[PDB]
Amino acid sequence: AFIILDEVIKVTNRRVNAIEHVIIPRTENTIAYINSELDELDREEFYRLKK
Amino acid sequence: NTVSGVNGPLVILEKVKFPRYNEIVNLTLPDGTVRQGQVLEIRGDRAIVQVFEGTSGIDVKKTTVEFTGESLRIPVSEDMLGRIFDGSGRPIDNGPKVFAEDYLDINGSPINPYARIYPEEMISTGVSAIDTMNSIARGQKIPIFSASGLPHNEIAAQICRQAGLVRPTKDVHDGHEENFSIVFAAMGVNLETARFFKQDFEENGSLERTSLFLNLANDPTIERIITPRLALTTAEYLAYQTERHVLTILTDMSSYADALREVSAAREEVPGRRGYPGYMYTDLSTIYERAGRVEGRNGSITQIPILTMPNDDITHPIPDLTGYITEGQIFVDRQLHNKGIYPPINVLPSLSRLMKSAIGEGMTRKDHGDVSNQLYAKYAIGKDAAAMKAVVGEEALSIEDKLSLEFLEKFEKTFITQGAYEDRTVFESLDQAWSLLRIYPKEMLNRISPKILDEFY
Amino acid sequence: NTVSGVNGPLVILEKVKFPRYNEIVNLTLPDGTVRQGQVLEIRGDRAIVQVFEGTSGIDVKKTTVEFTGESLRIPVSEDMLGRIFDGSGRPIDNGPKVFAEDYLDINGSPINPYARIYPEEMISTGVSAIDTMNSIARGQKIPIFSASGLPHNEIAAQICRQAGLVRPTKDVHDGHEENFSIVFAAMGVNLETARFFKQDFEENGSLERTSLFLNLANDPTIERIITPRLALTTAEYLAYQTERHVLTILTDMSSYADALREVSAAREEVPGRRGYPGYMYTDLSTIYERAGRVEGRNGSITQIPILTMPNDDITHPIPDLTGYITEGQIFVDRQLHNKGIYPPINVLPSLSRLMKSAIGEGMTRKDHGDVSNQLYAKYAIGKDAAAMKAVVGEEALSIEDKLSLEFLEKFEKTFITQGAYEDRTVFESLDQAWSLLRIYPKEMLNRISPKILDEFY
Amino acid sequence: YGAIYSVSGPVVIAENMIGCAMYELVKVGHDNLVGEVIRIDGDKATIQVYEETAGLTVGDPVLRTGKPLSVELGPGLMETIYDGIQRPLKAIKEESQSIYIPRGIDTPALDRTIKWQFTPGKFQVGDHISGGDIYGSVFENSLISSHKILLPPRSRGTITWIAPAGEYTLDEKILEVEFDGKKSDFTLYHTWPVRVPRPVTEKLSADYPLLTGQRVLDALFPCVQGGTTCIPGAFGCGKTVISQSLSKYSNSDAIIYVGCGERGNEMAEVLMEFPELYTEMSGTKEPIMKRTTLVANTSNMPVAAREASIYTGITLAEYFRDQGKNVSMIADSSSRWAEALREISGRLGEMPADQGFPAYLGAKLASFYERAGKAVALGSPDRTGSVSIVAAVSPAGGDFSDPVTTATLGITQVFWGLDKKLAQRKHFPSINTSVSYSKYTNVLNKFYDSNYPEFPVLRDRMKEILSNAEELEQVVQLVGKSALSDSDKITLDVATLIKEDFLQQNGYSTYDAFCPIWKTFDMMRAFISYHDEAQKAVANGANWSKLADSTGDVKHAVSSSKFFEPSRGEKEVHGEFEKLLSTMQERFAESTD
Amino acid sequence: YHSQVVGKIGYIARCMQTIDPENNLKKIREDYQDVLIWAEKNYRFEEILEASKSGKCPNDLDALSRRSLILLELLRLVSSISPFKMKLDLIESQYEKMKQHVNLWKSDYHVKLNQLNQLTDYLKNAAPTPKNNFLRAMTSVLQMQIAQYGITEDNEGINQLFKLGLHLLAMANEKIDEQYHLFKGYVKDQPEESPFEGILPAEDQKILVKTMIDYAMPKLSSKVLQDKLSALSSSDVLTKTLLDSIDRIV
């Protein structure tokens, strides 16, 4: 049981760092760029319609 | 003169200098139906006003002009409570005129009723978790975050029906012994919700002390947007005239934001991003301007706005602008309502600004913040131990995680759970928090004094 | 004539269409202050003119207009060094005289002094990664990319201070054959930021080798936008007149893009993406088009602009259009500056499409391009091995990731480590890059040739 | 003069107007409502109505004031609460009995009943005068620098008539100008617009220090007056305590508080907390209220007053900096000014940028940040002054990636990262050393280190002690507690005392949250000498538990530096910090053996 | 631009006329002859502005305001030492040394002159008390030592008197114990035998000795000690022997 816990501790320590490292930046940058493009893309039709 | 044209909800009338700003006008048609409206925009040799009765059916070569001579105002008196009226400012009770001797404008108070001091005395809303964990004082803006999956109208009706009952126990406790009033304004609600709110409020006995504002979804957006100004002006006039604490409930803010967004395309001003108008901060700030302690130190105007989201998304500008002006907010969880809790409100995502100073003296105890801090820490530790208990297992959990997990279900089904007509006070919520916190040992609580902890263990 | 109205920085005046386009005009106000402007639009009974100085306080019937009858031109002379002034067309602070003996147009094609051949030289700036990993030369454009968290102004002032002293060591080392000239232009900057650059320039060098161009933040964007035409005309007239290398610092590009992108909504034109105008590519292309070699084969104009990201994202049109229009790309990383590296210039996203022409072949070795490409590929492999050391560390890392991490750590902590006033050379940087690249095995160095790799193995 | 052409919403259009600038204030209608022309298209001008537009019809006359919309600069600005448009609410609170200014009533920036003693300056008849020169003085304060009456900016000539000493009103003329015959009549107060920069001799970098009463601020970076720094707020959950603790703990002569988009509770808590709390210099006769200026605008006010409140506070801070005194400007926040500019842009009908922010926020933020700073005072006297611009940064689009927060951080040269976890524990101010940064630490460290400064070595080792303590806590959490040496335990012990003493400060205390720069430099040098003595004693061979018992009273004396008062005969000099070096050297000598 | 240079020339002429009334400082008035020459001639403001704009009048209003701040600091330093008078050679050498400095505001001289002007300005609005008398005597001794030693030479007595004046100004009116202990330590730490003889009057020293004897008199409970301590209150001078004799009696 000690060899199994010592074997699983490295995989949990690797997955805990990789899952926290690779998770946030792609969805954060893609969501911020998608909302940033969707804001001006939504406002441009209202500005052209008002003009 | 004659009607120039009509396009959508706006009506083009021939007027040079006859109608004033906010002056009511009457259109005389030859079909036997007369309609009245308010001048939303005045220009030179033209008039753009929205009629409150109907949205079409007016002639362009047969209409007449009539001047009423009275601006759009709400009559504030002592007989407005205990009656049902419309959103435009007319009664619907089928009786005599309930107009009072005081006329106030719906575009702001002209007496400067803005507060200049921090609120000390707390106000009870009839909720144990909303009073203990996120309780607000007199003259504080605390909104209720809702969604499209829970009964936000029943949650506002439960807070309106539960309010006004703790004032007798607080007056008996040597606290708030003054008269209390309630401002009820409904915008974008159905007839079944208004009849269920009036029948539910009439059973508990709070309909006589409160005012009923009926605004349907088939009416104009100008009446629904002008409906909260009559309740805020009546609550400010009653709170300033009589020196009494008035708590106003405005539901829903999504119907007022949709009515203001619908009128943003009719005017010459262009709307902002996401379809809504860019001047929603001034419109929400105008309704939020009537808030704070009244002059005299004996009255205050409390406002409890209700905001409903489509999917609980914070990307809309209504949640950032509405939450930025208010000092905190209470969000309703969807998992608590599906689990069976009523009202399913979570204390982890909610936040209260100035929670250590929003508790008075003589009606609330001093250990409410210390018991609410240990109850919030035990609720967060039970929320973390509940999700960690499934991954860890039943034989690999911590010793404090089991008692915190049982205290999360017992505190969630004992403190958060409550009936629709069950009134509670600060002493009952403080006794329930001490009874729910009695399962934990003395070495697990350090956010309270030893005298109050050992005395009420 | 007379001004009909005023809306923002542009003033709408009613007059005849007899004046030509780009004619200089002066507005006479009753406060005793004269403002200069340029006629942007001419029509019958109405005209559109943009005032360079001043944005508000212009009366309709209380002000007058006067026609000078001359086109928009800035007088450039050879005595601009050792004089302090601001770029508005004249000295606003009452400093030195901006009068000269030659007149150059600011439309973008005064004489067409752009070179029609690929240049071949070695430009030294004092940075090992900027000189070796950038491949800069005479007449090459390299933009400095920074953020809001990192000190882009201190990095630009340190890069200009190292580039001002690194040029005489190369001129003594036979890297150039003419004098050096500096062109300092500030737009939308504070006095405290310009005082640090003037103190660093006076401490590192003198006050006569550079030009004084100051722009105030309380002025309009049209007055700050006129500084690049006078700086480019003075750098082109000074570089073409005396056959000297001119180095211009354009700071900041966010203010120049914020001026033309600022006034893009108050007019009748439709803007582009992100609210910017559709002619910003021609506006930045007009300043970027006046770069390269000069007439005679003894002149050159170097542009070292400083761009600050206002959102911290790659979706902005100013960094992509400025980096795509420029021949180089210098990116700054806040993570390298946070660890303690000075200057924190990242060579991973830096890539130019003119590395062959920027690499010198008569004043330096031919292995600088292959050593810079192998050092850039080994630096990117060391960055990917550093990301693999961040993900796994010691569970899936091989010997190649450990050797690439050690070479990336030694090259990152050795090549990117420097002071604030010391300078380097390409010969010492080639041996320093060869010493860090000597630790790699022969099996991993197959991208380089065996003759050049066997000599430095 | 003009006539009301149309009235639609908060913006009213008026036709038949000529000779009106882009900032001239006029009164539309018969009620005399306050307003200002935002734009002018053709013969008709568009004006924004700050007051309520209810009860205004087309056809009423519009009378202009004949000058631009500005505020009055004279005696009596301190000890008074006014709005962003120069409207005193304290004068209307007595007569009208209201909080804000009601509709149909408008008060001036200066009262007509308050009188001040006018004193003659160093000028005489026949001598040339200019703007910013010392024309006189008025005795109103005794604990700080008095508000000296200066000449009007953008005006010069010969002094033909000089007023004598005595008491006079601000409405009466006491000054005359001789230029081109009869130039004009001058008074005690002066008119100047808020949308124009104030005149000055020359602006430079911040090299003038000033008292602030911040141990963490003076310990993290060098204390100076004239810098620009931005800090994150809490939306009324700790930002008003840091602003009131910074304004109350600061020992400056003048104070400028500007509330643009506050809720109203922080303005009443700061205004009521200002006179009830005494100053650190032992001030009397309203030392906290008379020494500061009160400008509070709520969220329900007009966007023109909230946007012009920073211009009025920057104009009053520019006048106080031009008078020859150092003043600290506390503003909160830029998100309410950008939201008011976006609401004014959407209400006016212009085309805005993405996220509702227009392009004028960058130039207005750059002019507002460049307008405040330390420089030489303009005029013939050539005095020294400083203007510290401290503006809070809050979100305006639901995240930190907005153009207001990201654009405001680029123009500012100083950044202070507040911690929400430290502010939740009733601890303020708590600035993080990793997110914190300042560019003026070199000139302030060299100018302060010119005479006898030790702030750079204690500040670099103080920030490196917490930065190494964070990596030691992360390595102790990741690897374990029994994997570190005695150097990591000594660095964590010094970082716990430095973070507990500096980062663990309270904002509700009076003598436990305010201290001079010499007491903070001696307190940081006492901890750095104990850390260097512990590292040198541990390097020579010694146990960590034996060295911890070998320290003894040095750890309790160094840890007890946040509970003792700095007054021991002088405000800066303290003999107890001087004895801790000899006692720490005597304990360090026996600790090594 | 030119109006600030003309106003700085007229203010420099008025400050130069207020500095030397008999032409005793020829070195200070010699450098200001270019600005004082235009002030001694009857001319309009348009001729001075047009002469300053065309290079015929004094320009560099920033650099002229930099030396004008040093001249205003020398005039404020000479005026703040009233009613004491300084030497003409020490005023000319101090004006030459202060004028020869690269920066006149980035040092402790402007902060010491601003602190002395704030301490002298705080003494204008006061009442009779021991803190105002001790701060007035310390400000008079600091003004005499500042007029005797100048502002270009550091002295421990001027820094101790300035630190005692700032420490006395930083305290309230309920700090008679700390003002008496700081006055006893500052009086015992003074190297001179009498710091109030020749500058302050005999009524101020007798009022200070009567204030110290009246302050230490309420803590005694003996008739012999109260009579012996009360008998020393008639002295008109102040010295360390009176403080040691009053401390030995208590």
In a few lines, what is going on in this structure?
This is part of a larger assembly, with 1 copy of chain A (51 residues), 2 copies of chain B (457 residues), 1 copy of chain D (593 residues) and 1 copy of chain E (250 residues). Chain A is mostly helical. Helix content of chain A is 92%, strand content 0%.
What does this molecule look like?
Chains B, C: It is found in: Vacuole membrane. Chains B, C: Keywords: ATP-binding, Hydrogen ion transport, Ion transport, Isopeptide bond, Membrane, Nucleotide-binding, Phosphoprotein, Transport, Ubl conjugation, Vacuole. The structure is cut from a larger assembly and holds one copy of chain A (51 residues), two copies of chain B (457 residues), one copy of chain D (593 residues) and one copy of chain E (250 residues). Chain B is of the alpha/beta class. Chain B is built from 14 helices and 17 strands. In chain B, the strands form three sheets. In chain B, strands 8, 10, 11, 12, 13, 14, 15, 16 and 17 form a nine-stranded mixed beta sheet that branches. In chain B, α2 (152-162) packs parallel to α4 (191-204) and α12 (399-416) packs antiparallel against α13 (426-436). In chain D, the strands form five sheets. In chain D, strands 8, 17, 18, 19, 20, 21, 22, 23, 24 and 25 form a ten-stranded mixed beta sheet that branches. Chain D has a six-stranded antiparallel barrel with strand order 1-2-5-4-3-6. Chain D has a four-stranded antiparallel beta sheet with strand order 10-12-14-15, with no helix packed on it. Chain D folds into four domains: 1-69, no CATH class; 70-113 and 187-438, no CATH class; 114-186, no CATH class; 439-593, no CATH class. Chain E is an all-alpha fold. Chain E has helices at residues 2-19, 26-31, 33-39, 45-53, 61-79, 88-99, 108-122, 130-149, 156-169, 176-188, 202-216, 223-230, 240-249. The longest helix of chain E has 20 residues, at 130-149. The radius of gyration of chain E is 24 Å and the shape is elongated. At the B-D interface, β4, α8 and α9 of B face β1, α1, α4 and α6 of D. β4 of chain B pairs antiparallel with β1 (2-8) of chain D.
